[PDB]
Amino acid sequence: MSLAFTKTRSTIGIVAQPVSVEVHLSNGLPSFTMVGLAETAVKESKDRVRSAIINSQFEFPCRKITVNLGPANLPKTGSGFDLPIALGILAASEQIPLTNLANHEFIGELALSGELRGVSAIIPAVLAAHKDNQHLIIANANAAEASLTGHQKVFTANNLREVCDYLCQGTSLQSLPPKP
Amino acid sequence: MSLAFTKTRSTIGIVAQPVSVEVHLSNGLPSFTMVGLAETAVKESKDRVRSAIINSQFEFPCRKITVNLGPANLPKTGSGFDLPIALGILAASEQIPLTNLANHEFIGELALSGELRGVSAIIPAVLAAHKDNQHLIIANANAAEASLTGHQKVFTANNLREVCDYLCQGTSLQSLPPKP
Amino acid sequence: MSLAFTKTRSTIGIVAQPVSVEVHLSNGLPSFTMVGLAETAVKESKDRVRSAIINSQFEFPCRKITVNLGPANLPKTGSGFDLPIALGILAASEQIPLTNLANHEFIGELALSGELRGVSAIIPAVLAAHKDNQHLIIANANAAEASLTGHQKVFTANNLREVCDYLCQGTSLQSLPPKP
Amino acid sequence: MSLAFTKTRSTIGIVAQPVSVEVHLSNGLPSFTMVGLAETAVKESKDRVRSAIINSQFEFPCRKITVNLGPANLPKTGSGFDLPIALGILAASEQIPLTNLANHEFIGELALSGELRGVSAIIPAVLAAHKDNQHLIIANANAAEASLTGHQKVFTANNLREVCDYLCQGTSLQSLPPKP
Amino acid sequence: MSLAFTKTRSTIGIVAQPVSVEVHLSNGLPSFTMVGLAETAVKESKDRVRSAIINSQFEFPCRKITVNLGPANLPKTGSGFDLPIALGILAASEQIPLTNLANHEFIGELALSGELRGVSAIIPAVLAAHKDNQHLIIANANAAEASLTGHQKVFTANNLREVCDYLCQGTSLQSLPPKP
Amino acid sequence: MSLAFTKTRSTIGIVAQPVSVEVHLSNGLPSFTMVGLAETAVKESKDRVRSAIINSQFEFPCRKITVNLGPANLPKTGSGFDLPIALGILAASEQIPLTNLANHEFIGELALSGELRGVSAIIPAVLAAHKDNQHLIIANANAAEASLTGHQKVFTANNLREVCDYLCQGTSLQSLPPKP
């Protein structure tokens, strides 16, 4: 069977509580289910992620998908849950080796072309990821904001193809710009 | 490809936050998903855009239509998203050459005849468009309001066919009144 | 094509905003879609219009109906939108020549037999139609209330067949009784 | 044709406004639509009346029933709309001659088996039916409250077949208020 | 005829209002419809009744059930409507002699297996049953609370099959153990 | 037959009322019904439990599931109802002997891999289970919180297979950490 456990961060107040996106593909009819108290802003990432995956020259599963963005108590608010979901889908469809996601935290928003967009309130997530020793991968638009941290384990990408190539083969991504 | 990008502006308060209308025509059955936090454009812009496209002697895709409006975490209020969405559908269906959509914004609401009615609070959009060096193509009913600025590279249109010809061809569209 | 426009009024407070009912018949399956922020009272006019057209010895289209009500950002409240919509459907289905609907403004709801019924707050609509020099056609029940103002160029009908006859061949259509 | 115009009264505040319950059996698949701002306590009248009409040895049409009860903009709120709706449905089915509902106002809900039940706030309906010159009909349970007025033309009954007889062949409901 | 009039008591304020649970069984496709102001806790009772009936080695009809618990204007907020509904459905499909429900008031919910459970605020129901001289039947768990009154004629049971046998044959379920 | 009961606790106020979980597998089409006053956080457990059962190398019933968690008046508002539901489903589908669950109480949510996660406020459940003398089984993440009571019979586990072996085979494992 195939299931993937991607990591990310959700901000509640000042602390970015860890969140564990958990995709799981079944053999039933091609539905799409999201649980874990997903707010409307994050409950509509279904079609957005579908388009961002199809447009990046990938195979979007024709299978019963079931995302589980939850510790079931915490409601999810931000819009940065598209990159974790897309990478979880790809990893659970065997298009990405699941061992690449060992210790990475992904935060990003996907357009309909696969291009990544900048989420808001990124600093708490970067601080939490640094404190947890995890690698963080964010959209280019947040590179300027996260440059202050000066943490050497943060990478920024332009689109989903960049992140997929980095995970599968490690093409160096883009690092973060120098501290101001 | 079947992916098109368009630009418009949503007015919250006094600022006109740029919006990125993204249309992606998939291969499934007829659908018109409109992700992005639209309130009254959700289920109303669909039918107006469909009828305006059909009545202007255009092919309406018999596919799964996914429309994603600008930033995900930004409620979108006005009714002027019919022209950007219609042009995005036409571009994604190749009925318009999308290589000429880069420098132009679009604002307006479409009737069922393909005619362009006048949206409210338009001058902020003109200011923003000129600041960014973009052509702003608005409905004829807002020509009076747009003429105050006298900004060059701004235009106004009677119906959707006028704009589609101004893009496919290069016919001068309407210009603006000199300064009534 | 199968596309007809009608005019009516929407009374809020002391001002009767102009509303342009727009009807389009497409080739899809049977359906009836309203647009323009129509409230429950307005949005429930579908069945009333259907039965009023059917019982008046007219032909109700089997096509997909699509009614767009005037400005897309103005909620519609009154119940007098049944007559404009019925006339729009008949005009779009070629049952009526649509040149007659040029300068007239129609108000008044429809019973299930095709007979017209009165609607509250009719004086502002009469005033607005007077300022625009538009032939107003209202339900016969509203004659006893409108005629007190002694305003001419306003005609009152009892059933949809009467209005259709007046538009097709100018068969009188009664008139507001003397001020008495 | 298939149409019927029953009558009843709706009580808001102290006054009881006239409410013309109307029916139209259109050709098509089985269906049932209750137009006219009907609240839930009226919207279950669908099943209530269907069961009453199949438990009173009557025929329930297999046609697209369309029960409109206006004035449309009046928020019907009571629950004694089952009897007028059932009578109108029967009349539109040519089971009850429609020449008998000319001067009869009906009130009182229907039990699942056919027996009429008592609705609250009946006195204002009695007062209005007195100030219209109508044969007001109520459930037997309301005889105690109708007696206080002592008015005539206030016949009452226990089940549907009692009131169907008072209309078709067998007159003399013979349940006038106990005391003048 | 597949009809059954069971009875129960609804408690609002201090008085236990009478409730007449009425069940019909049409000849259509399988369905289920609860009529009246059935609150959430009541309308979920459909599956509870179905499971309790199936597990008790009874026969669940494959018909278009239609449960109506009047009056239609009194909210049914309690949860002890499960047992009366199950008994009515059984009696409708010639599974319980209808006559045996002559003067019995049933209160208490069910589980999937059919075992009865206690309900809150039982004393007023017993007081009303004594006043109206009905053979009240309550859940076994409610026996302890229904002792302070000390009224006779009140029976208790744990399984729905016990009540079915008592109604069909008569087995003296229990005797409401006395108090000092 | 295919009916299985499981026990758990819901914290309402300061007390942990028992919540009997009941699972019924009918013969109809594949479905899933959660009867009882279950909030979104609880009725979103269908997908979680299905995925946890499938991914643990178990068999998920291809039947009309019907989950009831009584009483039908307590607003079940916890987040650790997934483990009792999964255990009940497995027992109902003759996958776990039903005699094992006769004395144990279960708590803890599930992931899409079957691993158990830590619910909030486990202490009241431990206190109530000790008072009633039931073997409480909780997720490993709650071991630290459950250690500060000193009560034995608080065995823990990491995934569904662990608890299944604990019941089926008897591989008792894990326990409260010493007594800090």
Author numbering:
A (entry chain C), B (entry chain D), C (entry chain E), D (entry chain F), E (entry chain A), F (entry chain B): 1 to 180
Quote the authors verbatim.
In Gram-positive Firmicutes, it also has a role in natural transformation, while in Gram-negative bacteria, ComM is the canonical transformation-specific helicase. Comprehensive biochemical characterization of RadA from Escherichia coli, S. pneumoniae, B. subtilis and Thermus thermophilus and ComM from V. cholerae revealed that they are functional homologs during HR. Both RadA and ComM were found to be ring-shaped hexameric DNA motors powered by ATP hydrolysis to direct three-stranded DNA branch migration in vitro. Here, we present and compare the cryoEM (cryogenic electron microscopy) structures of RadA and ComM from S. pneumoniae and Legionella pneumophila, respectively, in interaction with DNA.
Local refinements were also carried out on half of the hexamer and the Lon domain, resulting in an improvement in the quality of the map in these regions. The final atomic model of the ComM protomer reveals that the N-terminal domain comprises a Lon protease-like domain, as deduced from its sequence. Despite their low sequence identity (28%), the two Lon domains superimpose with a root mean square deviation (RMSD) of only 1 Å. In ComM, there are electrostatic interactions between S26 and R50 as well as E22 and R117. In contrast to traditional Lon proteases, the interior of the Lon domain ring is rich in basic residues, consistent with potential DNA coordination at the center of the pore. This is further supported by the observation that ComM interacts with DNA via three lysines, K43, K46, and K64, which form hydrogen bonds with the DNA backbone within the central pore. Indeed, the Lon domain of ComM contacts DNA in at least three positions: K43, K46 and K64. In contrast, we show that ComM has a larger pore radius with a diameter of 24 Å. Conversely, the p-value for ComM, which is close to 0.5, reflects a non-specific interaction and is similar to the average value for its structure. These findings suggest that the hexamerization of ComM, which is dependent of DNA and ATP, is primarily driven by global solvation-free energy rather than by interactions between specific residues within the Lon domain.
